[PDB]
Each structure stands twice: as structure tokens, then as C-alpha cells.
């Protein structure tokens, strides 16, 4: 690269887009606003003779019905118009068969990268490990890495002849081969692994911090991350800000001479790392997270930072997808031969069939042995007859995320005991599935899971919602348990997909028969 010259690289990034091609109902984010933002940063940087690179940390799939229903086609096409250069493959890129992921690679005009995803039968990579970019006469390599938790999480589906090797180990190999064969001026890793304070990954697969620490110092300029779904803005050494506020300064993490960034989720921000490159080394000049029309409830909603207009061309591209998405919510996904009871004065007093249907859906998605939610979370009934996604969204309107915890029998006893204290005639009244007992005097008698007494030596998987897992309605906190996993699947999508594949539903199968009682 021509010697003793300082060059200017700006790296933009997003991650964990999760189907948010369209603005939300308050005019926040969406790719049309993202397009305007990125186009302006491009024009600015090009007027200063610098270079731009736009990377995604992945998880483009899964999270919004109008996207999910169309296999994220709008999202990938919109990304083409924004002009992404590359993305790392996320675990949610495996929510669909490989057919669909291969199809997303066709739609995408940028490479979907992952070095550590291998075909079992051949020992060969399924995807490109990296991509090379020429910015001016700089040679820049972007490697992709995917969390090796991908196939371990929930009830895994589409991993036929595939495996996920340790990304940290793959990174070593891949960096070494690149330096040897290409001598990139800059290597960046787009990853889908997660940021954990001080590398405290708990029972999750090690993520970016740990990888950064294990690599030779400064051997990557930066890691552009995702999966954990945080704004990586450090309040203190090895401690991210809690409740990071849009439009305030964001200090990215630096670990063993490698900058680690993450732009939260859903296109909420476009992150901007301005670097200067001289003599093979990279210096970070500035870092920020630019909100994409984020708003705070103050009752109305107000911008944090200047309004970014929606690119007209992105609106014309995406609208037909939006509109086709909405229409498809009206279509029959299934049928039931009986009324599923979701009325407030039932679901907050007794176990109902809708409770069991939802919880069945959540167990099925997670591989759980049992499940709980609060009655205040079932928000409508579905009448006998045909069922649409629009019906499911009335029943599950708050967009809670399905999660699970692996717990000892003893932790099961204590959790259920505590939950059993919640009283009828409140939203905190619990719906259970695969649980039986008679509560007497704050104590559970004959406690069983799936017909069997709870063995404190065994591990049980429980499904519920993030809302309850984080202490909603005074439920015991699970989000700090080693073994807690937020799956990222939305309650309503999980209920709809279960209804669709299970239909026609025979509701009798969801009828409680006195498994739980209080005296
Ligand atoms: Ni992920």
C-alpha cells in the first residue's frame, strides 16, 4: 500500500436485523431510513477521499411476520440497496432449510461469510470463510464466524451434514492463511458470537472478548459482532453500559489490541468506526452508534437525534413486501374444533386450553420438558373454526421472546413453589404445562413433571417468556442462571408455526384435567 501515507477507512455496521426491513409503528428504524443514513455517510467520506465498508453481524432472519412469511427476501433485497459489503452468518440463518439460506445468498449481492461452519461428511467449509475488498489500493479481508452454539440451542432442526467448529480456533487458522497468501493490510472479523463483559460467557459458547484475548494481539483491526444483541458501549473497563441511551457517546470495547463493536439489534443503530491506516497499523479516530430514528416515550414518542428521511427508492422496493406480508396475516393458517379460552376472567383464575396450546408451542420450539407463563399474557380467545395469524397476534400481542432454562430438579421445585404462590384474579396467575401438584400451605405436594416425580439429580428444561424470566409479575429471575437461553423467537411466531403444523387442532388434547390445584 504506498508507504508512510495515512489512509481513511470508515467501517459501518449493524447486526441482528431480525426481519426489521420496515419501520415500526412509531416510525423507528427500517431499511429506508438506514439507506438515507448510509448514503449520506458515503457521500461525506468520499468527499473527504476516504473509504467505506458496511458489514453485518448477521441474524437477518426471524422476528417480524411480514419478513418471516417471505423468507426475509425484503430484508436481503433492502440490504442490497443499502449496499452491504458482507455479513457473518448468524444462528438464525439456520431457522430455515439450507435451500432457503442458499436462496438468500443468491438474493444477496454481498457474501454471507462463515469460516467455521463445516460439512460433516467432507470436512469442507459450506460457506466462504472470508472476502477481500479493494478500497483504493488497500487490501482488506473480512472473515466471518458463527457461534458454535447454533446447533445446540432449543430444538435444533436443519443441521443435516453440518457442524459448527470453535470460531476462536478457526480464526487463528484463517488469519494465518490470509497473512501467508494475501497479506491483507487490514483484517476484520464479522462475527455472530456475542459480547460478554470481561469474557464472562457463563454457560454460553465463548464469544468475541475471549476470542480477542486468545488471538495474537491486534491481529484483527476489529471484531464486528452480534448475537448477544447489545450496544457495545463501555461504562468502565470490561463493563458495558446498562441502559445505553441513544445519541450519547459510545466507547467500544478493546481487548488485546482488537476493537469489538456491536450495534444492538433491528437496525436501531448504524455503528460508525472511523479509522486511519498507515504502515500496516490501524488507529481508531472515532466511534459512534448512529440511531436510526429511535424514539423515547415521553403520551408521545420523540426522536433522540435528527430525523432521517426514508429513502423513496427503498420504500418503493419494500412496500410490496410489507403489503403482501400484511395481507397474509388474514389467511387461514389452521383450524380448531373448539374455542380456545383466552378470556381474562378464565386465564387469570384457572388453567385453560389456550394456555396449554401456547406452552405446547413453546416447549416444542425449545425442546423443553415443561413450561410456564402468566395468565396476564394471554390477551384474547380464538373461536372454533379457522385461525389466521392476525388471530394469533391478538392472543400474543406484546412481542415477548420465548426463552428457556436448563434447571436441576431442586431448582424446579423451588421455582414452581414460588410461582404457585401467585394468586388467582391477577395477571400473575400461572399457566403451566407438564406440571402436576396439589398446593397446600405454600408447599407443593406430589410434584410431577410429565407424570413423574421431580428428581433433584436430573436436569429439566423449562420454557417461558423473557418477560417472566426477567422477573415480570414478580416471577423468579432466570436470566442470570447459567443455562438460561433467550432463543430470539417471538411468542406469536412460535404459536402460529405450531398451530400451522399441528392443524387441524383437536382442542381436547389441550384440555386441563386438574393436574394442578390449590387448597
Ligand atoms: Ni444470534
From Swiss-Prot:
One of its GO terms (cellular component) is outer membrane-bounded periplasmic space. Zn(2+) 1 binds at residues 16, 18, 59, 229. Its EC number is 3.6.1.45, 3.1.3.5. The keyword Zinc applies. Binds 2 Zn(2+) ions per subunit. It catalyses: UDP-sugar + H2O = UMP + alpha-D-aldose 1-phosphate; a ribonucleoside 5'-phosphate + H2O = a ribonucleoside + phosphate. Keywords: Disulfide bond, Hydrolase, Metal-binding, Nucleotide-binding, Periplasm, Signal, Zinc. This is Protein UshA. The gene is ushA.
